[PDB]
Amino acid sequence: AELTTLARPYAKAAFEYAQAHQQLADWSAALGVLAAVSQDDTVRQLLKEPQLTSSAKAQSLIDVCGDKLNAPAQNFVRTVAENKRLELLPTIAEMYEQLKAEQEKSVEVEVTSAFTLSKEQQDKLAKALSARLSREVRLHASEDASLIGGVIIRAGDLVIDGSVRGKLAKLAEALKS
Amino acid sequence: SSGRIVQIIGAVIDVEFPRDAVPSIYEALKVQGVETTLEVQQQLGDGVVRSIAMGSTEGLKRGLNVDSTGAAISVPVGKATLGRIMDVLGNPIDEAGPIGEEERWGIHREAPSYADQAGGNELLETGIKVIDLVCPFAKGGKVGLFGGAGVGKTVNMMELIRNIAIEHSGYSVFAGVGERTREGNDFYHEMKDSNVLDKVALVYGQMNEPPGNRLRVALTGLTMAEKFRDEGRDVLLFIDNIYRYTLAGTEVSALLGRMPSAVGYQPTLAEEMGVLQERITSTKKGSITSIQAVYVPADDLTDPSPATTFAHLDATVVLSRDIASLGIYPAVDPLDSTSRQLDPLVIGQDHYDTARGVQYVLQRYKELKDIIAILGMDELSEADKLLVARARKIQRFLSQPFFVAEVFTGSPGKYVSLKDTIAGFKGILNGDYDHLPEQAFYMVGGIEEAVEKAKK
Amino acid sequence: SSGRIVQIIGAVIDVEFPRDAVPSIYEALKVQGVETTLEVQQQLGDGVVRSIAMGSTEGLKRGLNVDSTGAAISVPVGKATLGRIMDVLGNPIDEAGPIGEEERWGIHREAPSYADQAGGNELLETGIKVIDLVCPFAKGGKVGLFGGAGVGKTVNMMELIRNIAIEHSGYSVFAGVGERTREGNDFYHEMKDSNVLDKVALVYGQMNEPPGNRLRVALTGLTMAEKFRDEGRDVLLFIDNIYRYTLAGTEVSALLGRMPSAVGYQPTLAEEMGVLQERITSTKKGSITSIQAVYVPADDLTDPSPATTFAHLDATVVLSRDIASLGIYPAVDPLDSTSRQLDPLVIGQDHYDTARGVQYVLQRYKELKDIIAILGMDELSEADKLLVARARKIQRFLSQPFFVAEVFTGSPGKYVSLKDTIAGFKGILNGDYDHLPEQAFYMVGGIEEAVEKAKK
Amino acid sequence: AQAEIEQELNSVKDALRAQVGALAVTGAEKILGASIDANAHEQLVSKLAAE
Amino acid sequence: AQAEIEQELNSVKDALRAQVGALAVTGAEKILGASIDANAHEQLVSKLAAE
Amino acid sequence: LNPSEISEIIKGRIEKLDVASQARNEGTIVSVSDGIVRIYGLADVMYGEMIEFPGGVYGMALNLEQDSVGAVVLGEYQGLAEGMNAKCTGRILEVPVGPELLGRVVDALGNPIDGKGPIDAKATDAVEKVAPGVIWRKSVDQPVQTGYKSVDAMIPVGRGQRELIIGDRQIGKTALAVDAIINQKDSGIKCVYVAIGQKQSTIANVVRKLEENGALANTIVVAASASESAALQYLAPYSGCTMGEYFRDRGEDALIVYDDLSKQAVAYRQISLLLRRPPGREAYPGDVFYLHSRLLERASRVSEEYVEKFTNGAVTGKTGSLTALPIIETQAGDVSAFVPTNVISITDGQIFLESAMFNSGIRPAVNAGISVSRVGGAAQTKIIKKLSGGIRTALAQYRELAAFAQFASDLDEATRKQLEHGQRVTELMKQKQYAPMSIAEMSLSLYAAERGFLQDVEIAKVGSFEQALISYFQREHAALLAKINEKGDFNDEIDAGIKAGIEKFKATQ
Amino acid sequence: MQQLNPSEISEIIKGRIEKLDVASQARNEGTIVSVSDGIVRIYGLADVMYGEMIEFPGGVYGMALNLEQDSVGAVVLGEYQGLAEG
Ligand SMILES: Nc1ncnc2c1ncn2[C@@H]1O[C@H](COP(=O)(O)OP(=O)(O)OP(=O)(O)O)[C@@H](O)[C@H]1O
Ligand SMILES: Nc1ncnc2c1ncn2[C@@H]1O[C@H](COP(=O)(O)OP(=O)(O)O)[C@@H](O)[C@H]1O
Ligand SMILES: Nc1ncnc2c1ncn2[C@@H]1O[C@H](COP(=O)(O)OP(=O)(O)O)[C@@H](O)[C@H]1O
Ligand SMILES: [Mg+2]
Ligand SMILES: [Mg+2]
Ligand SMILES: [Mg+2]
């Protein structure tokens, strides 16, 4: 079973409560704090001890976060701890943001090129992708010298490759096959 | 409302629906775009249902939308189904266009109550010597043709259809479950060429079809027979292999998350068989006469599937591989075969005494066969030598060439009557034919022809 | 870069590496504080790899640093390996110093292609009567000696190494896979004292060794044989026990996270066997004649390992415990043993008919065993009595004293030509020796010696 | 004989073809790795935005 | 036939050795989607010497 | 050694390069174990779809779990690694098809392994398909001569029938199927031989025997040897079936041999256990019956209407067929094993080979009592149908009679007549390998036995009598053999013609 | 690590966000979580006894046989196909 399989019930419950009560931004901050705090070298050790009870592990994590957890978020941490799932907090935060992004019709697109592209080109790629996908696009542009020229677009599981490296690979496979 | 395909593993598919909108057990679902139907087997919780696909899964993808139909698989019933070939979902699989349906029934139903059960004992003549002697059938009863691979189940079912279905004036249903597609084609052209097709509803689910189809075709054919029974009619129901319904459950059981039982069968073997077999019955409203062919894995009658089947039938006909291996046909075992109708108070003392007489002679011969093979025939008593000769002759007089077997035998087919059968076996038991050679009784219909074959 | 041990369970170790530096499948790794070698079997994800240790794991702990070598286990090959003893990793284990290697080859390779295959049928004489009669060998072909514990496999092989080296002038490669350390010492000193050692390469991974060694020693010996074949030479490849390669795979399979198959075997049983067996072949470049011993667990020839091995061989020699119990050696079973060379177009009609005649007589004698056990020989027909008498003489004439078996009894060894073998059995089948006593054929080499033994 | 002579003859052309194809790909990689600069992206990134 | 292949092989080898440059520049020009003569012949005379 | 030609061949691949942009669905490799690869992100992957990995390596999607995709590699997997990209091709597994494959040796994906050049086929087809339905079929009523009198007389095979060859190791299962392929070189039936889990030198020897007997030009050889991926061994029977179906769908006849379906089942069991699917009756997958039933139901005879519809009227008034000869291996004669039990329950008949008969010198080793054909007389020519009626059941009764009367004192004339005849037919059914008989040769042999001419002949002389009778009719009655061989017809003129020739033979040679 | 237990469904987890102590408030009442092969899994019924009878909608009755740490496994004393999640 993948960590994503185990985190799905919890991320979905947290998302539906946050959505129904208009708290989407509060839970986004709370789950992000819990994901970061539970990954700390001292907290990671404390959560794995065999002598501590589920409620002692939950209270220790709530006391450390304090100000960042409202009554519903504190109740959620006590629920994750009772079911012995505190190791899933980083995955629960990741899956909550995916449900939020899909609800808010938003897409984060990674982009890579051989050498830098202008704002005029980024805004031309952004309107083209937003018109194709029917979503708000956030271009995380970057460079990779492994490309001989052109650009590669990664809109989640969808990939659009217009780079020269991809064309050279197609030719190598065409001649070798 | 609608759900989405979340997982696909072989023939089993998981679909997720809104929690306020989970489809019911046995509910039918439809995939968007692709031409496939799913049946809910289980509700897994959290809005997810586990289902078996009623078609191949090669085109399916995760994330396809699925529509809840609000009901179980519903098939056309009544007069419009006669003279038509159909699949598990009730679609026509012949080029004759849409079915002239007026009503549709769901394939999942409760069995008739204890107060609705029938009580008839009207004897049915089959025209086959061994069956009419030791396995007498009755109208409105259940018959099972037990046997391994290559011993005659389909051939005996075809001879029984010829000697009962054609002459009968009611409706028939023929269900091909996990059958060879070649047998289905030969039978369709046979019913069509014989002008019998207008009396029969044909439902086919062959071996080339997915596990979900083979798991439900028996319920489709039975749903059509139940509509005719509940109208007050007398109906004939034929099932070429009921073992294939159990096997489809074994093939899918482990993918449905069920732990295996003895001999690798599904834990639900006896209940899945009981839920089907208790619907195949005659009631106070109307009657169903049924003949089922039962496959025996590796010829072992103690295998959980065959062993659980005997208790559901009135007449049990057993076919033996050792008899078939000696060129004797029909390859029926008179000692293992039996019927609820073999009672002097149901038939008569003359018939019963002849049947028990034949069985006594063959049972005693079974212990002497091993004696003769090591120490020779000459060491037996004067009574034993004579009895062995009669047993070998009786064993041959059980044989008969069938009209549906002319392509295998070369000789023509013989129909024999109940009185002719009784008289022939009493003659061999009393010693009226001790002078005839052993080869004269092999493949010869009634007793007269045996006297004639001895002269050739 | 380098990784860190994260888990240890028996012979299997999990190591975590940076995501940009994860080692390849079959790549060799070295533990920093002990220099123990590990072979990568699979990549688990998150930079973690699973490996098998090529040595003892006692004293290892979690958190130790591990170095990736960038290549698979590489062993020395060529002329420098002749007259030397090596371990699984190619290190010298004979105390004679470092190997004067010119190059090293990785132990993992693909089998030669379909277009590289050789069509050789040239007969190889073994000087052993039963083998040359019913199991004729061929140059560049594969032979398997099947047998349970203590039936004759190591003796019957060492007699073949002694007899085949008479006509062969090239090199030999010997791979000791999971067997006795004392027999490796006995064989090394025997060849050293006989001056035969400078034409043989020796590799060992005996029963005392951990699972990783026993699993890869077969590949190390085969890699040396493939170097000599690819140089255009004709070489002999001897594998002490090919079953141990499969068994070492069974000990590790559950630790590799694999679900077990029938009788506890690894699910990869047939693939692990095919990947090794297909490399042991003759090509258009050079030839490999190979002899392999195949252990039979609890004397069961239907066991998955022996059952999967038969299809990989040209000649199959089946040893029996029932035959060895009567005193007959070599304890070969003529009715179970066979060869691809037993064809009229390969060996000629005279040899073929003699071999077929011997098998017909021995088969008919085997059918009478139960009758003879209860009633004795005196009840048989005059034809069966004569056949049983010849069967008993043929069965005894198949025995032969070996030059490696002299220590066990005292009798001198015998080498019998194919011409003398055919002449003896043809005479016994024709009846030319019906007057000589049955004990005159036991342990006598050629047929003329049976005539001299009968004088006493 | 005759068919096998043609079997070898075409196999040699393929052995050469396998090396010439690798060299032609390497040549194209070296040419593009020198011929491409900022003047090419205004003719490639702009092209992709229409695709 | 094997002797003819051994004797004739260098005659075709020197012909393909000349064609590698033409295959490389035409292949790069296809991949670039625009004329390459102005930025490929100086690459051919400097890189082809290593093939 | 032609220059410029090689260049233009390369220019043809450069000219047609796909220089345009493509929209694709993609994932990343998570783990690589025993030929199984796990991937994240392939949202639109379909079940059984081809996955494209770096360096032209291909896989197939088999487990579409909610959070992961389980794929099997269609070749060597050891070059794959964590973090590599997995791509998606909107195509189901397809292989090349057509007459261009005749006389060639190919892998399970259709790539040539014979080194005889490229296969210029002009048509590809899907490896996994559903067989033609009940209404599109036609009854089997045309013969497939194997060339062996024991098989062609007692266990006949028709065009579109499925006949199982079953027995233990080393008793002639491959010899029977390869001789049946050799006999089709003049029949007009195309052949396919599928080798599953065999060693490459055994495959090369079968191909050499097909070529030495002149049968290779009419045969397609599909190889998935013992060292190849379990996925290729699992797919090979379906690839070969697809190549045979090309002829069936176009109004032509084909024959296919699966040299080991028990090795295909072992390859499928490996993949299924490595995908972690729950095991059954002998660790075999739950759907091991459906593995073979989905393959074997494609071998069939299709009606003129089906061929006319498939070819869009280009072929008319002709039926098409695919006949199958699957092989199964048993352990010490045990038929109760899960795989043997399944296949015997699917085919239109079986041919049982017995090791005791094989050791006793009856070399075709066919047990007439256990072997049977479900098509019977409809799969025979008029002459063989009449001359072989009842021989199978008569031999089955002779084997029992020979055991029952073995130690008893002298019996009646009916018993002596049956025993003496059964001994002669038993010696007659013996035949050598690579020596097939025509309809006329089998007919003379059957006629001399059933019409009583062998009653004066010694058992030890039946083989010599048959060989001499055939050689005599070949020299002095050649026009009669040519008339019998046109369609296997029979009438009083041919019956009297054979009678006169056999009488003259026995009275003068 | 371990697979999802029967109480690990979003509707149950969402209820503990509203009222942490949602269960044990009505120890005699529970909710159906899953239905399959005549077996019903229920969340709640904290005070059910081993072998006690459970009442479902429509006059259908079951018997409590698996009192696990997170849920109750009950078998139906009649037809189960009419029961549903929730
Ligand atoms: N008709 C025959 N007459 C004589 N010998 C025969 C005959 N048929 C087969 N044989 C011989 O018997 C052996 C049968 O081998 P074959 O490969 O055909 O059997 P198999 O069952 O397929 O064996 P395997 O299990 O190894 O595949 C061969 O040596 C073959 O030459
Ligand atoms: N009564 C019979 N007479 C002749 N042959 C028969 C008879 N019953 C079965 N057979 C033989 O068996 C096959 C048909 O039997 P079938 O009904 O298919 O058996 P099963 O249904 O038990 O598999 C044919 O090969 C046929 O020759
Ligand atoms: N004539 C003989 N007398 C006694 N033992 C013999 C004789 N010939 C061979 N052997 C037996 O041969 C065996 C050779 O190895 P074997 O036990 O068969 O194979 P393995 O040890 O490899 O499983 C020896 O253990 C020995 O007991
Ligand atoms: Mg049947
Ligand atoms: Mg030994
Ligand atoms: Mg074979």
PDB file of N, CA and C in Angstrom, chain C residues 322-348:
ATOM      1  N   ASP C 322      16.524 -48.557  -7.136  1.00  0.00           N
ATOM      2  CA  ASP C 322      16.099 -49.953  -7.230  1.00  0.00           C
ATOM      3  C   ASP C 322      17.157 -50.786  -7.966  1.00  0.00           C
ATOM      4  N   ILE C 323      17.738 -50.248  -9.045  1.00  0.00           N
ATOM      5  CA  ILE C 323      18.795 -50.913  -9.813  1.00  0.00           C
ATOM      6  C   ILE C 323      20.080 -50.998  -8.981  1.00  0.00           C
ATOM      7  N   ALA C 324      20.489 -49.917  -8.310  1.00  0.00           N
ATOM      8  CA  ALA C 324      21.685 -49.907  -7.461  1.00  0.00           C
ATOM      9  C   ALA C 324      21.586 -50.926  -6.309  1.00  0.00           C
ATOM     10  N   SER C 325      20.373 -51.189  -5.813  1.00  0.00           N
ATOM     11  CA  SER C 325      20.106 -52.147  -4.732  1.00  0.00           C
ATOM     12  C   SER C 325      20.367 -53.601  -5.148  1.00  0.00           C
ATOM     13  N   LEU C 326      20.215 -53.935  -6.432  1.00  0.00           N
ATOM     14  CA  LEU C 326      20.485 -55.280  -6.951  1.00  0.00           C
ATOM     15  C   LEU C 326      21.987 -55.572  -7.097  1.00  0.00           C
ATOM     16  N   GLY C 327      22.846 -54.547  -7.098  1.00  0.00           N
ATOM     17  CA  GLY C 327      24.299 -54.686  -7.232  1.00  0.00           C
ATOM     18  C   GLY C 327      24.861 -54.107  -8.533  1.00  0.00           C
ATOM     19  N   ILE C 328      23.993 -53.852  -9.509  1.00  0.00           N
ATOM     20  CA  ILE C 328      24.326 -53.301 -10.826  1.00  0.00           C
ATOM     21  C   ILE C 328      24.863 -51.867 -10.768  1.00  0.00           C
ATOM     22  N   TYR C 329      26.044 -51.641 -11.336  1.00  0.00           N
ATOM     23  CA  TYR C 329      26.691 -50.338 -11.479  1.00  0.00           C
ATOM     24  C   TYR C 329      27.345 -50.290 -12.871  1.00  0.00           C
ATOM     25  N   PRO C 330      27.224 -49.193 -13.641  1.00  0.00           N
ATOM     26  CA  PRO C 330      26.489 -47.973 -13.317  1.00  0.00           C
ATOM     27  C   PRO C 330      24.984 -48.257 -13.234  1.00  0.00           C
ATOM     28  N   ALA C 331      24.286 -47.640 -12.283  1.00  0.00           N
ATOM     29  CA  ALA C 331      22.869 -47.891 -12.006  1.00  0.00           C
ATOM     30  C   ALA C 331      21.875 -47.164 -12.933  1.00  0.00           C
ATOM     31  N   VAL C 332      22.208 -47.050 -14.218  1.00  0.00           N
ATOM     32  CA  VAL C 332      21.382 -46.400 -15.244  1.00  0.00           C
ATOM     33  C   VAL C 332      20.114 -47.202 -15.517  1.00  0.00           C
ATOM     34  N   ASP C 333      18.999 -46.525 -15.773  1.00  0.00           N
ATOM     35  CA  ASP C 333      17.732 -47.149 -16.136  1.00  0.00           C
ATOM     36  C   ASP C 333      17.518 -46.998 -17.654  1.00  0.00           C
ATOM     37  N   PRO C 334      17.694 -48.056 -18.471  1.00  0.00           N
ATOM     38  CA  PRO C 334      17.528 -47.998 -19.919  1.00  0.00           C
ATOM     39  C   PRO C 334      16.167 -47.486 -20.387  1.00  0.00           C
ATOM     40  N   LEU C 335      15.101 -47.744 -19.625  1.00  0.00           N
ATOM     41  CA  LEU C 335      13.743 -47.369 -20.027  1.00  0.00           C
ATOM     42  C   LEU C 335      13.439 -45.880 -19.765  1.00  0.00           C
ATOM     43  N   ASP C 336      14.120 -45.243 -18.811  1.00  0.00           N
ATOM     44  CA  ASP C 336      13.925 -43.819 -18.481  1.00  0.00           C
ATOM     45  C   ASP C 336      14.980 -42.916 -19.132  1.00  0.00           C
ATOM     46  N   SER C 337      16.168 -43.446 -19.402  1.00  0.00           N
ATOM     47  CA  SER C 337      17.267 -42.714 -20.028  1.00  0.00           C
ATOM     48  C   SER C 337      17.096 -42.623 -21.548  1.00  0.00           C
ATOM     49  N   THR C 338      17.505 -41.522 -22.175  1.00  0.00           N
ATOM     50  CA  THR C 338      17.346 -41.306 -23.628  1.00  0.00           C
ATOM     51  C   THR C 338      18.313 -40.255 -24.194  1.00  0.00           C
ATOM     52  N   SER C 339      18.464 -40.192 -25.517  1.00  0.00           N
ATOM     53  CA  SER C 339      19.335 -39.237 -26.210  1.00  0.00           C
ATOM     54  C   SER C 339      18.787 -38.835 -27.579  1.00  0.00           C
ATOM     55  N   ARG C 340      19.055 -37.595 -27.997  1.00  0.00           N
ATOM     56  CA  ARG C 340      18.685 -37.051 -29.315  1.00  0.00           C
ATOM     57  C   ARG C 340      19.443 -37.771 -30.446  1.00  0.00           C
ATOM     58  N   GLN C 341      20.594 -38.370 -30.142  1.00  0.00           N
ATOM     59  CA  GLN C 341      21.429 -39.113 -31.095  1.00  0.00           C
ATOM     60  C   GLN C 341      20.931 -40.533 -31.383  1.00  0.00           C
ATOM     61  N   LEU C 342      19.949 -41.051 -30.636  1.00  0.00           N
ATOM     62  CA  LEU C 342      19.371 -42.383 -30.842  1.00  0.00           C
ATOM     63  C   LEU C 342      18.392 -42.346 -32.035  1.00  0.00           C
ATOM     64  N   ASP C 343      18.925 -42.113 -33.229  1.00  0.00           N
ATOM     65  CA  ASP C 343      18.198 -41.959 -34.492  1.00  0.00           C
ATOM     66  C   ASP C 343      18.884 -42.761 -35.622  1.00  0.00           C
ATOM     67  N   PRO C 344      18.158 -43.542 -36.450  1.00  0.00           N
ATOM     68  CA  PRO C 344      18.745 -44.310 -37.553  1.00  0.00           C
ATOM     69  C   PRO C 344      19.625 -43.491 -38.504  1.00  0.00           C
ATOM     70  N   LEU C 345      19.327 -42.202 -38.695  1.00  0.00           N
ATOM     71  CA  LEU C 345      20.085 -41.305 -39.577  1.00  0.00           C
ATOM     72  C   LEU C 345      21.401 -40.804 -38.955  1.00  0.00           C
ATOM     73  N   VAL C 346      21.582 -40.980 -37.643  1.00  0.00           N
ATOM     74  CA  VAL C 346      22.765 -40.551 -36.884  1.00  0.00           C
ATOM     75  C   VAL C 346      23.698 -41.709 -36.520  1.00  0.00           C
ATOM     76  N   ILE C 347      23.166 -42.808 -35.977  1.00  0.00           N
ATOM     77  CA  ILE C 347      23.950 -43.972 -35.506  1.00  0.00           C
ATOM     78  C   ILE C 347      23.905 -45.231 -36.387  1.00  0.00           C
ATOM     79  N   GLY C 348      23.084 -45.254 -37.435  1.00  0.00           N
ATOM     80  CA  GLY C 348      22.926 -46.417 -38.312  1.00  0.00           C
ATOM     81  C   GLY C 348      21.913 -47.430 -37.770  1.00  0.00           C
TER      82      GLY C 348
END
